[PDB]
Design a protein around this ligand. Sequence first.
Ligand SMILES: *[C@@H]1O[C@H](CO)[C@@H](O[C@@H]2O[C@H](CO)[C@@H](O[C@@H]3O[C@H](CO)[C@@H](O)[C@H](O)[C@@H]3O)[C@H](O)[C@H]2NC(C)=O)[C@H](O)[C@H]1NC(C)=O
Ligand SMILES: *[C@@H]1O[C@H](CO)[C@@H](O[C@@H]2O[C@H](CO)[C@@H](O[C@@H]3O[C@H](CO)[C@@H](O)[C@H](O)[C@@H]3O)[C@H](O)[C@H]2NC(C)=O)[C@H](O)[C@H]1NC(C)=O
Ligand SMILES: *[C@@H]1O[C@H](CO)[C@@H](O[C@@H]2O[C@H](CO)[C@@H](O[C@@H]3O[C@H](CO)[C@@H](O)[C@H](O)[C@@H]3O)[C@H](O)[C@H]2NC(C)=O)[C@H](O)[C@H]1NC(C)=O
Ligand SMILES: *[C@@H]1O[C@H](CO)[C@@H](O[C@@H]2O[C@H](CO)[C@@H](O[C@@H]3O[C@H](CO)[C@@H](O)[C@H](O)[C@@H]3O)[C@H](O)[C@H]2NC(C)=O)[C@H](O)[C@H]1NC(C)=O
Ligand SMILES: *[C@@H]1O[C@H](CO)[C@@H](O[C@@H]2O[C@H](CO)[C@@H](O)[C@H](O)[C@H]2NC(C)=O)[C@H](O)[C@H]1NC(C)=O
Ligand SMILES: *[C@@H]1O[C@H](CO)[C@@H](O[C@@H]2O[C@H](CO)[C@@H](O)[C@H](O)[C@H]2NC(C)=O)[C@H](O)[C@H]1NC(C)=O
Ligand SMILES: *[C@@H]1O[C@H](CO)[C@@H](O[C@@H]2O[C@H](CO)[C@@H](O)[C@H](O)[C@H]2NC(C)=O)[C@H](O)[C@H]1NC(C)=O
Ligand SMILES: *[C@@H]1O[C@H](CO)[C@@H](O[C@@H]2O[C@H](CO)[C@@H](O)[C@H](O)[C@H]2NC(C)=O)[C@H](O)[C@H]1NC(C)=O
Ligand SMILES: *[C@@H]1O[C@H](CO)[C@@H](O[C@@H]2O[C@H](CO)[C@@H](O)[C@H](O)[C@H]2NC(C)=O)[C@H](O)[C@H]1NC(C)=O
Ligand SMILES: *[C@@H]1O[C@H](CO)[C@@H](O[C@@H]2O[C@H](CO)[C@@H](O)[C@H](O)[C@H]2NC(C)=O)[C@H](O)[C@H]1NC(C)=O
Ligand SMILES: *[C@@H]1O[C@H](CO)[C@@H](O)[C@H](O)[C@H]1NC(C)=O
Ligand SMILES: *[C@@H]1O[C@H](CO)[C@@H](O)[C@H](O)[C@H]1NC(C)=O
Lengths: 614, 614
Amino acid sequence: FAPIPRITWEHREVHLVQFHEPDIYNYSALLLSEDKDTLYIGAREAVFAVNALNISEKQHEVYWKVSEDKKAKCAEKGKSKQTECLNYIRVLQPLSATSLYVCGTNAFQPACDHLNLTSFKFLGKNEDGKGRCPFDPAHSYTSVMVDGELYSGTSYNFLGSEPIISRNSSHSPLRTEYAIPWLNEPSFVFADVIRKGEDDRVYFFFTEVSVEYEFVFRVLIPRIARVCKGDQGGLRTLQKKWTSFLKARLICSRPDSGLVFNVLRDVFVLRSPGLKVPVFYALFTPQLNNVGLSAVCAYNLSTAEEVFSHGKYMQSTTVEQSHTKWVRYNGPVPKPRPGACIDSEARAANYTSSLNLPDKTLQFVKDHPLMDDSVTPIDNRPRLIKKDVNYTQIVVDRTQALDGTVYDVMFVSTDRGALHKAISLEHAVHIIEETQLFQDFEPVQTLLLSSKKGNRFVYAGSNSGVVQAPLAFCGKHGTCEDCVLARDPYCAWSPPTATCVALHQTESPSRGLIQEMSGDASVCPDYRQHFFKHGGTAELKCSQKSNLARVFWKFQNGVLKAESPKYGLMGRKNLLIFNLSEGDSGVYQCLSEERVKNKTVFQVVAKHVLEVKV
Amino acid sequence: FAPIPRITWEHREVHLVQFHEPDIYNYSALLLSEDKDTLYIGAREAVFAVNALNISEKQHEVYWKVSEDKKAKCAEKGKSKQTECLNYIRVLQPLSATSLYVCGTNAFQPACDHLNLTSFKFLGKNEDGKGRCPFDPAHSYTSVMVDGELYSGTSYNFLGSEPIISRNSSHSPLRTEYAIPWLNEPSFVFADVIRKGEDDRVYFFFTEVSVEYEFVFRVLIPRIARVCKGDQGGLRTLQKKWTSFLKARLICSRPDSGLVFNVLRDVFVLRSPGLKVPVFYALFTPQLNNVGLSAVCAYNLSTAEEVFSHGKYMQSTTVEQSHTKWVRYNGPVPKPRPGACIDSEARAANYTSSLNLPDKTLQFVKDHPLMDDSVTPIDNRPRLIKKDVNYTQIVVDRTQALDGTVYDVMFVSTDRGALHKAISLEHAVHIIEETQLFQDFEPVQTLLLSSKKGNRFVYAGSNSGVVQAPLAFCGKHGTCEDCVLARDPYCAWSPPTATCVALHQTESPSRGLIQEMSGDASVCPDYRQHFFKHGGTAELKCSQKSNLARVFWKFQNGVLKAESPKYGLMGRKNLLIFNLSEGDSGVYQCLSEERVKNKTVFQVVAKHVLEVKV
Ligand SMILES: *[C@@H]1O[C@H](CO)[C@@H](O[C@@H]2O[C@H](CO)[C@@H](O[C@@H]3O[C@H](CO)[C@@H](O)[C@H](O)[C@@H]3O)[C@H](O)[C@H]2NC(C)=O)[C@H](O)[C@H]1NC(C)=O
Ligand SMILES: *[C@@H]1O[C@H](CO)[C@@H](O[C@@H]2O[C@H](CO)[C@@H](O[C@@H]3O[C@H](CO)[C@@H](O)[C@H](O)[C@@H]3O)[C@H](O)[C@H]2NC(C)=O)[C@H](O)[C@H]1NC(C)=O
Ligand SMILES: *[C@@H]1O[C@H](CO)[C@@H](O[C@@H]2O[C@H](CO)[C@@H](O[C@@H]3O[C@H](CO)[C@@H](O)[C@H](O)[C@@H]3O)[C@H](O)[C@H]2NC(C)=O)[C@H](O)[C@H]1NC(C)=O
Ligand SMILES: *[C@@H]1O[C@H](CO)[C@@H](O[C@@H]2O[C@H](CO)[C@@H](O[C@@H]3O[C@H](CO)[C@@H](O)[C@H](O)[C@@H]3O)[C@H](O)[C@H]2NC(C)=O)[C@H](O)[C@H]1NC(C)=O
Ligand SMILES: *[C@@H]1O[C@H](CO)[C@@H](O[C@@H]2O[C@H](CO)[C@@H](O)[C@H](O)[C@H]2NC(C)=O)[C@H](O)[C@H]1NC(C)=O
Ligand SMILES: *[C@@H]1O[C@H](CO)[C@@H](O[C@@H]2O[C@H](CO)[C@@H](O)[C@H](O)[C@H]2NC(C)=O)[C@H](O)[C@H]1NC(C)=O
Ligand SMILES: *[C@@H]1O[C@H](CO)[C@@H](O[C@@H]2O[C@H](CO)[C@@H](O)[C@H](O)[C@H]2NC(C)=O)[C@H](O)[C@H]1NC(C)=O
Ligand SMILES: *[C@@H]1O[C@H](CO)[C@@H](O[C@@H]2O[C@H](CO)[C@@H](O)[C@H](O)[C@H]2NC(C)=O)[C@H](O)[C@H]1NC(C)=O
Ligand SMILES: *[C@@H]1O[C@H](CO)[C@@H](O[C@@H]2O[C@H](CO)[C@@H](O)[C@H](O)[C@H]2NC(C)=O)[C@H](O)[C@H]1NC(C)=O
Ligand SMILES: *[C@@H]1O[C@H](CO)[C@@H](O[C@@H]2O[C@H](CO)[C@@H](O)[C@H](O)[C@H]2NC(C)=O)[C@H](O)[C@H]1NC(C)=O
Ligand SMILES: *[C@@H]1O[C@H](CO)[C@@H](O)[C@H](O)[C@H]1NC(C)=O
Ligand SMILES: *[C@@H]1O[C@H](CO)[C@@H](O)[C@H](O)[C@H]1NC(C)=O
């Protein structure tokens, strides 16, 4: 299990910019512009444009509030008039340079519209968002705009009994089948297009009730799925339906410890400036006995692609003679491959679209959407497993250290408004710091990263507002030792400026900078006076930031024992000399000790010169 | 989830009698005599007889140490010469008035013998305990002596690859089949005879790899099983094999919370003086994501009896065409019923023993040992679910309160040498107290209850020694309020003696005693002076035992705020007045507040009269 966050930053001790509109709640949708300087917020009954560099600067505002006759219609359907019967923005996507595509629950009448960016006024397109947007603010939902066409995963109805992964195309509308083999009680988590003869694919991530597994209760299972951008459906069968829909198990577990995380919470696509293949960073929690635990598994796209392209499918079979069981299909697979895209191979066999695929192949995919092979993580284990924390959303920044060693920086939000910064150091997790983003411990519902030159920020939304944080707080570190010991690839010590700087931001010289991810503060170069009355009591204040260090006191060059009657420890860090007399005068030193590898790192926290009067 | 233990007793603050022999370890077997005054301890390479009333009084001792040629033989087989290659006592059972039946691992040569009680010397019977006793001190094991015949569940071999539930009878030896349907990687937990035409039954409890369930990893499942005392095996088939072996799922879970506890740790049989039917109190932990959690489920014997007597069996089937799946069997069941005992019905159809049962019935049971129905707990939920605690063994005492309301008192041991006392109050768990039995936090391996008049004790064994504790510490409670607030059915307040007494032990008058399980201390009838120097500092000590209460201070009839500079709180309970002056003199009161139901209970903990000198 991952250790405790090395340093805890109170909302008070760091520079965090906040945004909220009075009487406006549920800041669940976040979208930043092309230029990255304008962040758009989708809340309950409102859409805003804020300066992404200072979220507190409100630029534009637009509302989409529900009428009383629509609220009462919703309430008459036994829903909560002042809770669920309101317009929760669920779809906030780029449409053009001059517009956004917006959908809201709208007292259970999913409605879509175009937000005119030049005016920040809605165009009144008033489209029926049934299938595109959920009815209930409680229902799961995911959407990705690909080539001005919305690819959405949510419920097709009011009750949330009909799930749907569909494309609102207008030219070629396509949707999933309303069948258990296709989708079995899913809870949508994330979707994105993975761009390139070879066609683009639109991946979907969700948790659904498993068909392959049987246990005491119904077992959930994380799913990775994909569809082909060029899909047009089948001609005779799969009319207006996906022909390219294949899914597989997403497995996040440490078995030598019986830890299985079968509930997917978030998915982030690490788009490597260097690496040609994207890495999905997926966030999971266990369905069973969650108390709570969180795990972060990283999946190489190539792995998943290997399953969808060459993996054996699963067959459903009748078993004695009213039951259905699912097993590996070892029978003959049709050609062209069921679920495959219109690639170079297909085009050679005179196949231009799904509309001209053989009925043999189309029937196969319709009856075999599920793959036998699981999609496994890189190094076949989670990147991080944490206890006593319920992680909510994830973002990852691939950063180059001073050394040139590349670290994948994990920003993980909690259900209590906190953000953890973690890196997988040499075969062990290091949680650099934790920051309390929300003073009200509101769970971070959404998280969004901008790693772009200048505007390097993380944006977190909750029901109470939005928070803007940098990727590091290098300046909070006082000494070179403190700067190095942090083991943050973002932070380096600058001897000329006598400040711990943010490497890859500051205008300090690279060649003349200090950073050691080993934590060996050895690479570094290197008195509060008091006058108290006789008989009186002294409180010598001492504090440090490491949650992984312990402090001890020293008087007259010896390790002082804070025991009654002469001594006491107030708050485990502040020394208390009780009965002051001639001999108590002199130097009192507060020291810290923290283990890095095998070695211990002692640091002098406080220096005190106590003088007792006569 | 169950709250935290109301009061924590340090090993220091309670009267606990301890026993251990220098250089003797692993005190895993405990057996008390008929008279209940002599407790026999089975350790590694030794057996002792101690006064059960004062375990520290060693009465008798006997050793059974392994020879160097036997240790070296064991070590040559790649085992640990100074760890596993020693005689761990595994079987410590009553044989007669003048003898005990003892088996030890014996450097992987399971050996049995008779301990002559009149001499406390072994008889040298030197029986081969293969099947009766495990080879490895790591292997699971269970045994019950029924009518001078040992019924044992353990491994049949060195590697622990062959499991076995068998009867060392001499007249009619019987054992299980070495087949997955019968036993699939079991870990034995407990066994006992459930006594009465109707035959007696010998129940077995264990955890084994499930055949009915399929998940990411192999799923374990707790099992309740039984065999008939009168079994003699089959004549043509099941030659020297159990014909009465039936098993079923033992289910301990809260599903509205996704909590499943599929690993059985201990089983206790509540033999009710009043209730005609015994209740099994079973202790479970989860296989998946245990961090750790413990649950206590109580099962009514009648329920289990209903499954074994009328439940539909499970069939194994071939599925496409190399796999095996298990489903409910809805086909024709033979008569006499497979797995049933030789009852009144069978005897009418001229069946005297298993040896004369039709081959039809015998073949059925051999191919269908597993039942389709699960054995569920009373009120279909656990009696207790606890987090942050790994419970090891359980005992239950059915006790009558002053009111006459019967409480089933749960004594639960932990893997850190602690004992919790819990009762299921009105639809909520109340953990009365917790006691640190082992100063070395050694896990309690075995637990044994003597609820008998006079000698009312709990005996706990660990690798470091044995501990003797009473069932209550009524005397530790100071006031009537404190006595009542404890909500311990064992404790009552005595106004004449001004002491909190143990109801059903003391010679105090029943009619003139105070006890309220509601916790309403309203039924009850109803100054440390200091003189400190001017300018000096005062520490006003205040403490109480409730882990569920918080203390606040009062000065000059007002709730004082322990904030800098004038005030401070040392250890969250001790008040610190910093700069003494004329006005600081007077009465300082430490008060406690604890919620019972809705209401708060304020109590005056400490009274102080502080006088500041001039
Ligand atoms: C994600 O999965 C892809 C799929 O294989 C990984 O890519 C491949 O990794 C292998 C492993 O070495 C490469 O093979 C060879 O690399 C050595 C190293 O220099 C080279 O000397 C050999 O001549 C050969 O090229 C393979 O080329 C490479 N292919 C691609 C397209 O990347 C990828 O590394 C995985 N990424 C992660 C983070 O797991
Ligand atoms: C949108 O944001 C608002 C802002 O907090 C969320 O409001 C909160 O709603 C919950 C109920 O869903 C309130 O909890 C209470 O639950 C008990 C249980 O029955 C009920 O008896 C109480 O009357 C109350 O509803 C919570 O107090 C409330 N917060 C505030 C400040 O009023 C809202 O739930 C969010 N909606 C979504 C879809 O996230
Ligand atoms: C354990 O399971 C047994 C199996 O049923 C339970 O025993 C039975 O409980 C029923 C429930 O009432 C008894 O039926 C009736 O009880 C009422 C109460 O006075 C009486 O007025 C009716 O005339 C009738 O007797 C049934 O007789 C009883 N049978 C036996 C053998 O006990 C038992 O109570 C369960 N114990 C626990 C702790 O769950
Ligand atoms: C019987 O009781 C003794 C008394 O404590 C138990 O002794 C303990 O045995 C464990 C190993 O099983 C020792 O732990 C260590 O494990 C590491 C891991 O490789 C190893 O490198 C060390 O050399 C050592 O073996 C533990 O220190 C030891 N306790 C003492 C005081 O020596 C014994 O395990 C118990 N046997 C059974 C079957 O319960
Ligand atoms: C989007 O909003 C802009 C903002 O007004 C609209 O711009 C006006 O467009 C009309 C022609 O249609 C011009 O005559 C006005 O002078 C424009 N005003 C401004 C301030 O630019 C634009 O038309 C809107 N687009 C749509 C589709 O409604
Ligand atoms: C969602 O589907 C509707 C259904 O057609 C699309 O609506 C058409 O939109 C185009 C402009 O993009 C208009 O020219 C057509 O006249 C519209 N027809 C109808 C019937 O509405 C809509 O554009 C789709 N939206 C997205 C984001 O894909
Ligand atoms: C982690 O999240 C779980 C829920 O997923 C929390 O468990 C709930 O805690 C509340 C608080 O009293 C209880 O009322 C609920 O009944 C609990 N539900 C379940 C399923 O346990 C858990 O407390 C959280 N823990 C941490 C460390 O974040
Ligand atoms: C059990 O131990 C007792 C203790 O000695 C044995 O008792 C002796 O028995 C012999 C006859 O066999 C008598 O002559 C001795 O006088 C007895 N001595 C005592 C002290 O009682 C007894 O024999 C042992 N039982 C077995 C089976 O060996
Ligand atoms: C375990 O099985 C052995 C096998 O027979 C039993 O041994 C017999 O024990 C009786 C006395 O109980 C002797 O009279 C016989 O001569 C013994 N025969 C053999 C071959 O040993 C043994 O008693 C059984 N033990 C238990 C506790 O049931
Ligand atoms: C409860 O028991 C579990 C084991 O069943 C403990 O978990 C182990 O804790 C040690 C301590 O560092 C680790 O080294 C092991 O790797 C852990 N194993 C597993 C499977 O988690 C757990 O810490 C115990 N917790 C409590 C509160 O008793
Ligand atoms: C932008 O941030 C600065 C930094 O303190 C602040 O002074 C300024 O008022 C902010 N702008 C707005 C509109 O809040
Ligand atoms: C029995 O317990 C008493 C109580 O203190 C003790 O004094 C006595 O020595 C114990 N007996 C033995 C043999 O330890």
